Design a protein around this ligand. Structure first.
Ligand SMILES: O=S(=O)(NCCc1ccc(S(=O)(=O)c2ccc(O)c(O)c2)cc1)c1ccc(O)c(O)c1
Ligand SMILES: O=S(=O)(NCCc1ccc(S(=O)(=O)c2ccc(O)c(O)c2)cc1)c1ccc(O)c(O)c1
Ligand SMILES: O=P(O)(O)OC[C@H]1O[C@](O)(COP(=O)(O)O)[C@@H](O)[C@@H]1O
Ligand SMILES: O=P(O)(O)OC[C@H]1O[C@](O)(COP(=O)(O)O)[C@@H](O)[C@@H]1O
Ligand SMILES: O=P(O)(O)OC[C@H]1O[C@](O)(COP(=O)(O)O)[C@@H](O)[C@@H]1O
Ligand SMILES: O=P(O)(O)OC[C@H]1O[C@](O)(COP(=O)(O)O)[C@@H](O)[C@@H]1O
Ligand SMILES: O=C([O-])C(=O)[O-]
Ligand SMILES: O=C([O-])C(=O)[O-]
Ligand SMILES: O=C([O-])C(=O)[O-]
Ligand SMILES: O=C([O-])C(=O)[O-]
Ligand SMILES: [K+]
Ligand SMILES: [K+]
Ligand SMILES: [K+]
Ligand SMILES: [K+]
Ligand SMILES: [Mg+2]
Ligand SMILES: [Mg+2]
Ligand SMILES: [Mg+2]
Ligand SMILES: [Mg+2]
Lengths: 425, 425, 436, 422
């Protein structure tokens, strides 16, 4: 039905292993990855990656989130970077095979007591320019997040706040920070200066583990491919670091100087893309799924209940994708937390949700712009078919495949409760 | 509430090891779930009175067994008529009506090598009288099952054949017999004479294990409550034997002389009911579900994929029930094979399928009698509402419970593909 | 298959087909059940002890010799019936039958004598008849007391006090027979040497459909504590009048062994029935089949995970010896013991290997029958001048007795467990020896 | 306080996910660093005074890269290493043996090259302990290296370097005839796509752990430390992940051979390895190693499993083992005990070679002999205890597992004893 060739690809012999030791022993360099790369790539915009033509090459290479580092540059400089990103993104609104939403994230300069005056002004700039995410620098406690949230004013409550953990206090107060944040960034640069360099891997693994347990995005950042600022190829430690961040459970991986100022910004994005694809196939889903299941408390929320049912069904049939309809991205995030091998294709009418779901591993957003049908059930079927046809066009799906489809019982956010098994025709 | 988590051996259910699970079993933890292992009662002089049969149905009898080793065809036709008269006396309340299957147990081949002439005549009697199940005596190989199937003719294509394993050859050729049978009966009486008495428990445990792995019904039979033929209370070994047959994984438990000729037929049914309810709560679902999922192969059949998704969703939310619409009983059987703690309420229009699904542990059949609605989606919803209303009346459901609803995308058998999370209102 | 390939080439495919070894290698309990085979013959010596109640059907010396040969390890005297004179005669007949085999020290079978008390009756604590019967037990040298209707820790303290300073070595097995005993189980087990799941009264005191829960819970907790647990009452009841038991009875015996019972008991089946010897033979045959069907892979992992870390060298040596025995498919673990404690600590990890306990104490040799898998050998030789040579002689006695008894063959590996100095409490050494 | 140190809350976790969640930057490592450090000797690390600092920093194996330098150059490096090592021999209870490994140039465009034959002969003549054989592609390459060592070099350990696709594909046949493996990531990263090297590393480490044979992770682990005093975030993560993967040894090449911070690079590897060893999830690792190790009738194999099990049961500070060839210590090491394996040996070569096995701390026995063999054994065990107390491995009141044999000579280990310290 699928063939022996299917079961030799994407580390499937290592996937069937009964122990983690046997899983390692069965990893094969000749077993090619087939699934689309699920860990998002955040690229820092700077002199080496500002031009519209360079940004088009970075989008093609795999960049999903453009980071603006507000530690340098004026508001005028960053507004031009935003306009260049949006111009490069919209240049592909013709071909549906190449069009992809790209999120814009603002990284603050940092704190002094309370939020700095420059951070208040930069956060206001972000709201005025429609940024999707804020990477808040030096978050140490829950009140630091509340201050950033308050500065996002009356108009920016939909912006995701990713708290950067950069010091001992942030690590110690991690649980209270994660509870009030949308996600976390393991900011290894400052963290490696604030705590002993030999302890950073413990903080990284702990934070990734806790974010995976909470179902919240976690970004691994800084010096992942550092030598690529001046060299065309990374060191053996650098490729290992990227692979291990993905195996640890990071939703996003980041490039800073590699894309902002280095000589090989596009090559650095290509390298992160190539490593993440290899590492995602090497994940030991048998143990991961069982442990995510065992740790996750019982839930009476139908979205959470449908999500675990859909992920279980996708593993049972080797589903090419899980197509989910989402207004805020939440139904896609709840599927993503169980780490399915199947791609989560999120169909949405919200351009902001489409950009923000790049924070969740394995979510491939599709922005639906067709006008509503008069009959709601027909409008749902048209969006389900839109995900199927986009999936066929991009290579996720073929006729005869099985897909899991996740929808809700009435319009509006918060009513997901249906999982369907569909044969692609 | 805290009271909820003290009942149905929930502290023992949360245990991390089987040893800790045994340590946490509590005699004060009352069973809450409806009894899921079916009771087969043999009909005889002690249980043919229509008024006595009504008491046995109320006590929990699900399948009435006619032992063709004793009595004439005229005697068995009167047994069938009395069973049907007692069963149909409750049809005036469709929300509480309990279907009861009729099983024909053959005399056997005797000194012959294959199907005897008396068995050919008895099987034809069964088809003419509309029996639901055949317990075929002394099945030794796959060709014995084919001969029973041939003797049932074209009119008896829907009858379930449960092969009785009663000797060494049947145990050795078990795999080939199970492959062509609808299920198995561990016929301990003859088996204990054909093989050493001290080895029967090994054959019982092996056969139950293999049937659970195949997703096919398995019946534990003979001398389970033997002393209740003359005494009002069973021995300590007898109550333990019933509990252990349920813990082993038997779908059905049987009564022979206890109901056919003894002085306490109703009390024997009540005792099996009481023990099975206690033993089902003591099942270690944490290990059982993991092992059934791991052993079950990948499937591209949407009914099988929806079944595992629905069972996973039911465990996630502590669903009171899985309501499934079924024509042949197949969708209910595929849910049952994963051993959910949630009751599988099977709503069907087929009176025969309603009787036959008693062979699957945890399937509670409801016979829907209303003619089809003009709009198919309304007819589906009416059947689901009938399941909810029957469930509320019988104590399976309460307002505020979560229920998993399993349906298909079009009319007719074979199209189950939808799982939905529903709150009981 | 790579984890057993070399040992399969060495020991042969026939070795790995016996004693439910394909079911033993299974990765899940479901696959373990699927691989159980009625043609896979048991090889190991029966490890669950059989307690037989002595009565009119089993009191003669000649009948007792047949019961010892059939497998009886513990003789139970039910003090609910019979006078002190009647029970003293039963004790003398048991000792005469047991000593008739003492001529060959290498094959002699010690048999424990257990006194089962009448109980408190309508009273709240220790009755006057129990005080008199317990003093009779001390005066007649009984090894074990099965204390009836234990409801709390003070009930066992009262039994201990009635035994006096002379009965300090007697094992107290508390009988759990009612709701209060089940609810106060933890405090009772803490002060008892073991437990008896007394299903007869328990099945009257609590709903009959709940007894299996109390049995499984108590066996689980005793296995966790490493203390003996006895499953009792109506196991082979129909064998009082019939030569073959019912299908529920053979299942009940097998399930008590699979649950983890150290001992199984016969009451009326041996005390008053028409087939006392056949009932013992049936329990022996079922226990051997059920012991091979135990899923050691999960059981050993769970016993290890649940057992707290220990700084007691006897406990540390015990787990190391059991681990080593599983690694090499050791035929036996030979242990030197004074009180039986080192053998009990090996037994709590449920090795597949027989635990051959070499002791000079006749009482400890009788009492270790309470621990599953312990085969006592009574050493009658006087001590050597050099302690190290005396220890080596005792180990060689175990090997030679094991060879003559069929436990050990040339080429087998055995694990030997000893201590660093004389006296109880100093076990700390494990050795791997090849049988030549 | 005991249960807050060495990641013990994370060690008690019921799942790997919970284990990650409980990792604590404030939980200080207490156990001695188990993963050996191999430092390449070059212009930056050739002086006797420099080598003494590197030994104090944690260097266990000195690597001589025969791709560069003459035989005269390498003989001087060997003499300087031995002079620095022997400067600490005055205190036998604290003396640290250091192995000398010869890394061959390789076959180049060719089987065994003529320069490799000459270099291997040099190694035997100069008493090297280990050979890192370059570009091993099949079992016959190992046989050729073994033949070139001759009858005088029967005791030298051959660690096969896997550097290309053929070596990865023929891994099982190479490991079967080798003493261990080196994941030579430099050439491997050029021979196969750079994004696939982590898969080859994890597979090879897993298979060596399964076989109970040493595995070395090598190349660019702390590359930026050649010119900078601190490594990058990717470099510290790489070292930690090689240890978490299961590497017995970690290596420094240019960082020690030609870089500006050779001592600091050794100190950095030491600090990271200690932190990573405490973060190992022993609960799962021991169960998996135990399950996968085949049944055995070899008493040394049987005693080793029993001793490791007993060490975990009592939180033993150490397993003290008497060994002639190092084999009894290697069989204990394969089960990855948390307890240090203190190997007491009279063989100076075995003391150097057991650095290839994670968690084996060699002690070279040089005390006068005892006339009674039982007394001589007891004295070697007391020597293990005293050196352990002096070095901080043991304290009074600790439990240790002692692994001895029933008669003199190698191959007779069969005894495990539980001993209370002082
Ligand atoms: O299922 S996974 O992809 N886990 C694999 C990672 C892993 C498990 C266990 C160990 S171990 O130290 O026990 C060990 C190390 C090396 C061995 O050879 C060995 O046998 C055992 C190390 C590493 C996963 C990832 C992230 C999670 O949050 C999660 O819940 C599960
Ligand atoms: O390892 S053992 O020898 N026997 C395991 C007995 C057992 C385990 C699990 C279940 S289960 O309900 O999960 C289940 C039932 C039926 C299936 O087919 C299935 O896959 C799973 C039932 C029974 C053992 C005995 C006593 C102990 O105290 C102990 O720690 C371990
Ligand atoms: O993931 P979210 O934000 O809750 O959105 C899920 C919602 O999407 C839907 O599937 C479709 O709703 P709309 O037609 O309003 O887009 C709802 O039925 C469901 O509640
Ligand atoms: O379990 P079965 O026999 O396959 O029946 C399931 C069928 O029942 C339904 O849910 C309802 O079908 P009907 O309207 O024909 O009764 C179908 O959609 C589905 O295919
Ligand atoms: O199991 P116990 O009661 O602790 O006895 C074990 C004891 O037996 C021995 O092996 C032998 O002791 P004895 O010489 O006193 O008989 C002791 O070394 C050890 O302490
Ligand atoms: O690990 P190896 O090489 O097998 O050496 C272990 C040997 O060491 C000993 O413990 C002591 O032997 P020596 O007295 O020869 O040093 C032997 O009993 C044992 O066989
Ligand atoms: O700010 C950052 O990204 C850091 O410190 O690593
Ligand atoms: O026929 C039967 O039911 C039997 O033999 O047990
Ligand atoms: O006393 C007993 O043995 C009982 O009640 O079972
Ligand atoms: O030779 C080496 O060490 C390499 O290639 O990495
Ligand atoms: K910044
Ligand atoms: K019949
Ligand atoms: K009594
Ligand atoms: K070289
Ligand atoms: Mg920073
Ligand atoms: Mg029969
Ligand atoms: Mg009683
Ligand atoms: Mg190289």
């Amino acid at each position: 039905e699928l063939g022996t060739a299917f079961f030799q690809q994407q580390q499937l012999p290592a996937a069937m292993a009964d122990t983690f030791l046997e899983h390692l022993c069965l990893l094969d360099i000749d077993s090619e990855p087939v699934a689309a790369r699920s860990t998002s790539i955040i690229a820092t915009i700077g002199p080496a990656s500002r031009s519209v033509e360079r940004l088009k090459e970075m989008i093609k290479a795999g960049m999903n989130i453009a980071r603006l580092n507000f530690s340098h540059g004026s508001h005028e400089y960053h507004a031009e970077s935003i306009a260049n990103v949006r111009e490069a993104v919209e240049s592909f609104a013709g071909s549906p095979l190449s069009y992809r939403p790209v999120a814009i994230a603002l990284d603050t300069k940092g704190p002094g007591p309370g939020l700095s005056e420059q951070d208040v002004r930069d956060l206001r700039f972000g709201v005025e320019h429609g940024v999707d995410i804020v990477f808040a620098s030096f978050v140490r406690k829950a009140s630091d997040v509340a201050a950033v949230r308050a500065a996002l004013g009356p108009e920016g409550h939909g912006i995701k706040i990713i708290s950067k953990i950069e010091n001992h206090e942030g690590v110690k107060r991690f649980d209270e920070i994660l509870e009030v944040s949308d996600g976390i960034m393991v900011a290894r640069g400052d963290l490696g200066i604030e705590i002993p360099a030999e302890k950073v891997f413990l903080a990284q693994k702990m934070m990734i583990g806790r974010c995976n347990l909470a179902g919240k995005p976690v970004v691994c950042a800084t010096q992942m491919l550092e030598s690529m600022i001046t060299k065309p190829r990374p060191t053996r430690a650098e490729t290992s670091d990227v692979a291990n961040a993905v195996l640890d459970g990071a939703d996003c991986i980041m490039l800073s100087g590699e894309t902002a100022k280095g000589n090989f910004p596009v090559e650095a994005v290509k390298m992160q893309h190539a490593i993440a694809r290899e590492a995602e196939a090497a994940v030991y889903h048998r143990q991961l799924f069982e442990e995510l299941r065992r740790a996750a408390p019982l839930s009476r929320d139908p979205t959470e209940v449908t999500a675990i049912g859909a992920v279980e069904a996708a593993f049972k049939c080797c589903a090419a994708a899980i197509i989910v309809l989402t207004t805020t991205g939440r139904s896609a995030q709840l599927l993503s937390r169980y780490r399915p091998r199947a791609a989560v294709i999120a169909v949405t009418r919200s351009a902001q949700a489409a950009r923000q779901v790049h924070l969740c591993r394995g979510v491939f957003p599709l922005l639906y712009r067709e006008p509503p049908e008069a009959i709601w059930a027909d409008d749902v079927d048209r969006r389900v078919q839109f995900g199927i046809e986009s999936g066929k066009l991009r290579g996720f799906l073929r006729v005869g495949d099985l897909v899991i489809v996740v929808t809700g019982w009435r319009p509006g956010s918060g009513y997901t409760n249906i999982m369907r098994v569909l044969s692609i025709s």
